[PDB]
Amino acid sequence: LVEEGFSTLEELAYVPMKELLEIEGLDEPTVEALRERAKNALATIAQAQEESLGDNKPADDLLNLEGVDRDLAFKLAARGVCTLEDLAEQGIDDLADIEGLTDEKAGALIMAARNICWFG
Amino acid sequence: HYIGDLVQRTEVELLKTPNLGKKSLTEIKDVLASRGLSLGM
Question: Which segments carry the region annotation Acidic repeat 1 (AR1) (chain A)?
């Protein structure tokens, strides 16, 4: 694949099927499987990065609690609090070191998360 | 401060307290139950 000029997962996911079928030893089923794997890998990388910081996964799950700005969602996800369930399981003491989060604001967000996860 | 103060609080009130998780609430119930006490008396 690299000798045929493919360097990125994006090229393999999006390039016209004809160019991948010009490679010696690729059949239409194997090209389809390779593209599906490349798209699934790109989706897994996009989900992984979105959960590590606050791009989409933590910008929706961890940010469900009313009051969570995108910056706070990424600060939470940097501590491994990636979902609204992960936030509902925290104590105030576990979040006390997050810059811009007061004990009162931490307590309000944990209670909002618990109200949605455990009482919704 | 006292066991008599704890026994008067409801489970819903204890979940509002700061640094109070679902795990610590289950621990408090299991310990009170071992002494024949329940929350909300």
Answer: 1-54
